[PDB]
Amino acid sequence: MDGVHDLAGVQGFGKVPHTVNADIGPTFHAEWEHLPYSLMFAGVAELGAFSVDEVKYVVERMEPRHYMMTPYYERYVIGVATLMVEKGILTQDELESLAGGPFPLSRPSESEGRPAPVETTTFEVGQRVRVRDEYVPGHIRMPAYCRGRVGTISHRTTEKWPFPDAIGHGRNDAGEEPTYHVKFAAEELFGSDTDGGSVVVDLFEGYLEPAA
């Protein structure tokens, strides 16, 4: 999903709000902040109601303005709430009644997702791959800066996981794939307009193809 969450490479932001080793304060800066993650795990591990991938995607589904003005932990309150309503566990009425006011949710999905790719390649360390030049309206774990670009394999994972583009929509056909550490030269991604060296993206097999 080409949403505003896909921030890598966006220009115009100011300074990162940190200097190295500065005091970051406590783990939680308000007494509710442990709730989003805790309740995500309740949903995943205790209820079986959704995957972590579905949490990533429902946060991507926040209305874009809403996403941009919402603090991090609040986005996950909104996202977990949204999934609980979509899955029929909770109602928005009861959320708003308990909250004493409005509790707008993420927007409905506008994709049903896609299956794990039928045809993929097992790549080796040192091999050159291209990120498939595809557009996925639903969830995908491919930042757009690498779409269509060329890089080389630095690692193939020794474990496999469900394809995000399927399990992030709660589908039954996510299968399993390894992922690959794909190293891109900075210039491959941003031309002359970068001060970096290389970027390594951890890409599912189904996002990749052999280079030319």
Binding site: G9, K15, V16, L35, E96, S198, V199
Partner: protein, 196 residues
């Protein structure tokens, strides 16, 4: 372009808790147990321990760099958001830095939950494109003879940086070395500092 009307976030978060808890869906003590894990167990002290061991034990270093999951498991530090671990080695010509441009993904058990700045739009947007300038602004100058490599945490690999061991620490104990490996050293935005 206005913000939507919203109840206070604290009210919304506790409404979500209460809605679920009142339906019997949240075990006794569940969220309080997670809070304790997040606060007390998941910690960059663990990654610092691992770095110090690597610095003082060539065999362990090799293991950490080749099978980070196995190395971490020896210490019992695998966990949520930290099940498949890769450690990345800084060298005299290479500085590694970690981000999650899409969200916030972090090796929780060994780095701790991410700090606010790591989850900022500024860091997420900028470090993949201009890491040298970002690190400079944050207080870390990377000499121009060093390639910067940014790892974007886009799948299930969870990373830690193995920084170079600074001069002036020869013969230090594991405890002494751990003290100088900070959270920011593990993320990759800082280099371990040795006092004057």
């Amino acid at each position: 372009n206005a913000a939507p009307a919203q109840a206070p976030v604290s009210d919304r978060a506790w409404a979500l808790f209460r809605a679920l808890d009142g339906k019997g869906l949240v075990p006794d003590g569940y969220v309080e147990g997670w809070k304790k894990t997040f606060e007390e167990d998941f910690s960059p002290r663990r990654g610092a321990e691992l770095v110090a061991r690597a610095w003082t034990d060539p065999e362990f270093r090799q293991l950490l760099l080749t099978d980070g999951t196995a190395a971490v498991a020896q210490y019992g530090y695998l966990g949520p958001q930290g099940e498949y671990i890769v450690a990345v080695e800084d060298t005299p010509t290479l500085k590694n830095v970690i981000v999650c441009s899409l969200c916030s993904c972090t090796a929780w058990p060994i780095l701790g939950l991410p700090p606010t700045w790591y989850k900022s739009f500024e860091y997420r947007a900028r470090v993949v494109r201009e890491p040298r300038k970002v690190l400079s602004e944050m207080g870390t100058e990377i000499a121009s003879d060093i390639e910067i490599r940014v790892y974007d945490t886009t799948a299930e690999t969870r990373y830690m940086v193995l920084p170079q061991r600074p001069a002036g620490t020869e013969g230090w104990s594991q405890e002494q070395l751990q003290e100088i490996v900070t959270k920011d050293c593990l993320i990759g935005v800082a280099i371990p500092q040795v006092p004057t």
